[PDB]
Design a protein around this motif. Structure first.
Motif, PDB file in Angstrom:
ATOM      1  N   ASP A   1       0.820  -1.205   0.000  1.00 38.85           N
ATOM      2  CA  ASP A   1       0.000   0.000   0.000  1.00 38.85           C
ATOM      3  C   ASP A   1       0.857   1.259   0.000  1.00 38.85           C
ATOM      4  O   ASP A   1       0.478   2.262  -0.615  1.00 38.85           O
ATOM      5  N   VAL A   2       2.011   1.222   0.668  1.00 34.95           N
ATOM      6  CA  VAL A   2       2.954   2.334   0.652  1.00 34.95           C
ATOM      7  C   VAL A   2       4.361   1.790   0.868  1.00 34.95           C
ATOM      8  O   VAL A   2       4.558   0.753   1.509  1.00 34.95           O
ATOM      9  N   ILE A   3       5.337   2.497   0.307  1.00 38.33           N
ATOM     10  CA  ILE A   3       6.754   2.217   0.495  1.00 38.33           C
ATOM     11  C   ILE A   3       7.300   3.205   1.516  1.00 38.33           C
ATOM     12  O   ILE A   3       6.735   4.284   1.729  1.00 38.33           O
ATOM     13  N   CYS A   4       8.396   2.832   2.174  1.00 38.30           N
ATOM     14  CA  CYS A   4       9.064   3.742   3.091  1.00 38.30           C
ATOM     15  C   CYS A   4      10.555   3.448   3.107  1.00 38.30           C
ATOM     16  O   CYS A   4      11.009   2.366   2.723  1.00 38.30           O
ATOM     17  N   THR A   5      11.313   4.444   3.548  1.00 36.87           N
ATOM     18  CA  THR A   5      12.736   4.322   3.806  1.00 36.87           C
ATOM     19  C   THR A   5      12.973   4.348   5.309  1.00 36.87           C
ATOM     20  O   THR A   5      12.082   4.677   6.096  1.00 36.87           O
TER      21      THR A   5
ATOM     22  N   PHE B   1      25.178  -5.825 -16.904  1.00 37.67           N
ATOM     23  CA  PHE B   1      23.929  -6.482 -17.273  1.00 37.67           C
ATOM     24  C   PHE B   1      22.747  -5.562 -17.045  1.00 37.67           C
ATOM     25  O   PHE B   1      22.594  -4.998 -15.962  1.00 37.67           O
ATOM     26  N   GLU B   2      21.901  -5.424 -18.063  1.00 36.58           N
ATOM     27  CA  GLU B   2      20.802  -4.477 -17.974  1.00 36.58           C
ATOM     28  C   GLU B   2      19.728  -4.974 -17.017  1.00 36.58           C
ATOM     29  O   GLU B   2      19.355  -6.150 -17.024  1.00 36.58           O
ATOM     30  N   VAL B   3      19.239  -4.059 -16.187  1.00 38.74           N
ATOM     31  CA  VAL B   3      18.129  -4.334 -15.283  1.00 38.74           C
ATOM     32  C   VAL B   3      16.828  -4.185 -16.057  1.00 38.74           C
ATOM     33  O   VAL B   3      16.494  -3.091 -16.528  1.00 38.74           O
ATOM     34  N   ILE B   4      16.092  -5.284 -16.193  1.00 37.54           N
ATOM     35  CA  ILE B   4      14.856  -5.319 -16.961  1.00 37.54           C
ATOM     36  C   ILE B   4      13.739  -5.801 -16.052  1.00 37.54           C
ATOM     37  O   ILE B   4      13.857  -6.856 -15.419  1.00 37.54           O
ATOM     38  N   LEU B   5      12.662  -5.026 -15.990  1.00 35.77           N
ATOM     39  CA  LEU B   5      11.457  -5.408 -15.283  1.00 35.77           C
ATOM     40  C   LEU B   5      10.286  -5.447 -16.255  1.00 35.77           C
ATOM     41  O   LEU B   5      10.271  -4.702 -17.242  1.00 35.77           O
ATOM     42  N   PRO B   6       9.310  -6.323 -16.026  1.00 38.63           N
ATOM     43  CA  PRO B   6       8.083  -6.269 -16.824  1.00 38.63           C
ATOM     44  C   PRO B   6       7.405  -4.920 -16.648  1.00 38.63           C
ATOM     45  O   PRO B   6       7.418  -4.338 -15.561  1.00 38.63           O
ATOM     46  N   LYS B   7       6.828  -4.412 -17.739  1.00 39.25           N
ATOM     47  CA  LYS B   7       6.155  -3.121 -17.671  1.00 39.25           C
ATOM     48  C   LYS B   7       5.064  -3.116 -16.610  1.00 39.25           C
ATOM     49  O   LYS B   7       4.833  -2.088 -15.963  1.00 39.25           O
ATOM     50  N   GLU B   8       4.399  -4.256 -16.405  1.00 38.48           N
ATOM     51  CA  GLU B   8       3.354  -4.330 -15.391  1.00 38.48           C
ATOM     52  C   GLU B   8       3.931  -4.197 -13.986  1.00 38.48           C
ATOM     53  O   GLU B   8       3.302  -3.598 -13.109  1.00 38.48           O
ATOM     54  N   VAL B   9       5.124  -4.755 -13.752  1.00 40.80           N
ATOM     55  CA  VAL B   9       5.764  -4.621 -12.444  1.00 40.80           C
ATOM     56  C   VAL B   9       6.076  -3.160 -12.152  1.00 40.80           C
ATOM     57  O   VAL B   9       5.889  -2.682 -11.025  1.00 40.80           O
ATOM     58  N   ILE B  10       6.551  -2.425 -13.161  1.00 37.77           N
ATOM     59  CA  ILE B  10       6.876  -1.012 -12.973  1.00 37.77           C
ATOM     60  C   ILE B  10       5.617  -0.214 -12.655  1.00 37.77           C
ATOM     61  O   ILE B  10       5.588   0.583 -11.711  1.00 37.77           O
ATOM     62  N   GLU B  11       4.553  -0.426 -13.436  1.00 39.23           N
ATOM     63  CA  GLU B  11       3.312   0.317 -13.233  1.00 39.23           C
ATOM     64  C   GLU B  11       2.723   0.047 -11.853  1.00 39.23           C
ATOM     65  O   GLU B  11       2.183   0.954 -11.208  1.00 39.23           O
ATOM     66  N   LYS B  12       2.810  -1.200 -11.389  1.00 35.83           N
ATOM     67  CA  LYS B  12       2.225  -1.555 -10.100  1.00 35.83           C
ATOM     68  C   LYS B  12       3.087  -1.081  -8.933  1.00 35.83           C
ATOM     69  O   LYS B  12       2.561  -0.556  -7.945  1.00 35.83           O
ATOM     70  N   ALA B  13       4.408  -1.255  -9.024  1.00 37.60           N
ATOM     71  CA  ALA B  13       5.272  -0.859  -7.917  1.00 37.60           C
ATOM     72  C   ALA B  13       5.318   0.653  -7.745  1.00 37.60           C
ATOM     73  O   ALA B  13       5.616   1.142  -6.649  1.00 37.60           O
ATOM     74  N   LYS B  14       5.023   1.406  -8.809  1.00 39.96           N
ATOM     75  CA  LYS B  14       5.030   2.863  -8.717  1.00 39.96           C
ATOM     76  C   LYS B  14       3.956   3.379  -7.768  1.00 39.96           C
ATOM     77  O   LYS B  14       4.162   4.400  -7.101  1.00 39.96           O
ATOM     78  N   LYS B  15       2.809   2.695  -7.696  1.00 39.97           N
ATOM     79  CA  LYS B  15       1.699   3.182  -6.878  1.00 39.97           C
ATOM     80  C   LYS B  15       2.088   3.361  -5.416  1.00 39.97           C
ATOM     81  O   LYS B  15       1.903   4.466  -4.878  1.00 39.97           O
ATOM     82  N   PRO B  16       2.632   2.356  -4.716  1.00 36.47           N
ATOM     83  CA  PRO B  16       3.054   2.601  -3.327  1.00 36.47           C
ATOM     84  C   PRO B  16       4.217   3.575  -3.200  1.00 36.47           C
ATOM     85  O   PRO B  16       4.376   4.181  -2.133  1.00 36.47           O
TER      86      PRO B  16
END
Ligand code: SF4
Ligand SMILES: [Cl-]
Ligand SMILES: [Cl-]
Length: 303
Positions: free
Chosen positions: A124-128, A279-294
């Motif tokens: 729901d949210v990310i924190c440091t 080595f290039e860091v590659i994530l699925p576009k769906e992972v990026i869109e979803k992880a951005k929300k929190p």
């Protein structure tokens, strides 16, 4: 020296190929010195967002480079050791998150930035470590699910007064398990030294320290504390960062603490990374869109 040849070739290749080097505070000093920027994981990700360059060489562990990628999806992010990872983050799983969501459906899932990208898609949210206390204070619920570090979670509970349910069981960072007896011994040796420890440290360590702060907060403490000597309870790479930033002070490791995965990055494989551009860091576009929300939820709460 063979290192002088390597550093020269690294600086040569990074200019020719248009790479910005971002290094975490726990990298070896030789890599911190050839980096364009040295900071914590969120600092480096936000710095990349300001760059005109479209190529990044990241020196840290995989969840940090992926964090850079998530906030900079159109840049090519490469790492020199693709197995550089965080064992604490990898102990939390999607299955455990969903199990506790079902047990406590009214408690927001607060995920330490130190987490797999896959888990971030479920938070729901990310924190440091720096903003965790404030993020949880600002949430409506007086109960939160927090992972994957139990010590940061229990520190948040102390500071917010809220109920903090930590997942998984015994989630912790092995690098920060200092002994509180080391603070006793060091105050005898340096009676006027200030002791700063990470919130990932166990409670007896945090309670005997003068300050508790993340690496980003540690390096702002000498801006307001005039003390000659600081004792540092975090990974050994921060000593070099601190001594470089405040050369008029002395920085003493509470104990020798080394994160082996952080030390997988060397001059040799950093040079190899620039030579091959891997080595290039590659994530699925769906992972990026979803992880951005929190992550965006965290910016909104903090701002
Ligand atoms: S120092 Fe601890 S929290 Fe940081 S990457 Fe290493 S194991 Fe993970
Ligand atoms: Cl800052
Ligand atoms: Cl981008």
């Amino acid at each position: 020296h063979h290192h002088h040849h390597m550093v020269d070739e690294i600086l040569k290749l990074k200019k020719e190929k248009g790479y910005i080097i971002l290094a975490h505070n726990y990298q070896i000093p030789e890599l911190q010195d050839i980096a364009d920027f040295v900071g914590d994981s969120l600092q480096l990700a936000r710095k990349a967002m300001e760059l005109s360059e479209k190529k990044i060489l990241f020196l840290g562990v995989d969840f940090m480079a992926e964090l850079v990628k998530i906030l900079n999806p159109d840049k090519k992010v490469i790492v020199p050791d693709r197995s550089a990872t965080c064992p604490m983050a990898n102990r939390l799983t999607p299955e455990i998150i969903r199990e506790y969501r079902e047990k406590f459906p009214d408690a927001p899932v607060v995920l330490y930035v130190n987490s797999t990208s896959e888990c971030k898609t479920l938070a729901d949210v990310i924190c440091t470590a720096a903003n965790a206390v404030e993020v949880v204070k600002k949430l409506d619920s007086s109960v939160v699910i927090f992972g994957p570090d139990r010590n940061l979670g229990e520190y948040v509970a102390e500071k917010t007064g809220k109920k903090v349910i930590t997942i998984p069981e015994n989630g912790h960072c092995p690098v920060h398990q200092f002994n509180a007896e080391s603070i006793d011994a060091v105050r005898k040796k340096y009676p006027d030294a200030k002791v700063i420890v990470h919130p990932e440290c166990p409670k007896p360590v945090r309670d005997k320290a003068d300050y508790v702060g993340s690496t980003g907060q540690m390096e702002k403490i000498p801006e307001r504390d005039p003390s000659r000597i600081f004792v540092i309870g975090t990974e050994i790479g921060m000593i070099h960062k601190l001594k470089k930033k405040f050369p008029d002070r002395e920085f003493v490791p509470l104990e020798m603490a080394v994160c082996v995965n952080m030390k997988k990055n060397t001059l040799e494989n950093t040079l190899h990374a620039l030579q091959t551009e891997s080595f290039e860091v590659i994530l699925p576009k769906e992972v990026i869109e979803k992880a951005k929300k929190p992550i965006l939820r965290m910016f909104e709460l903090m701002g």
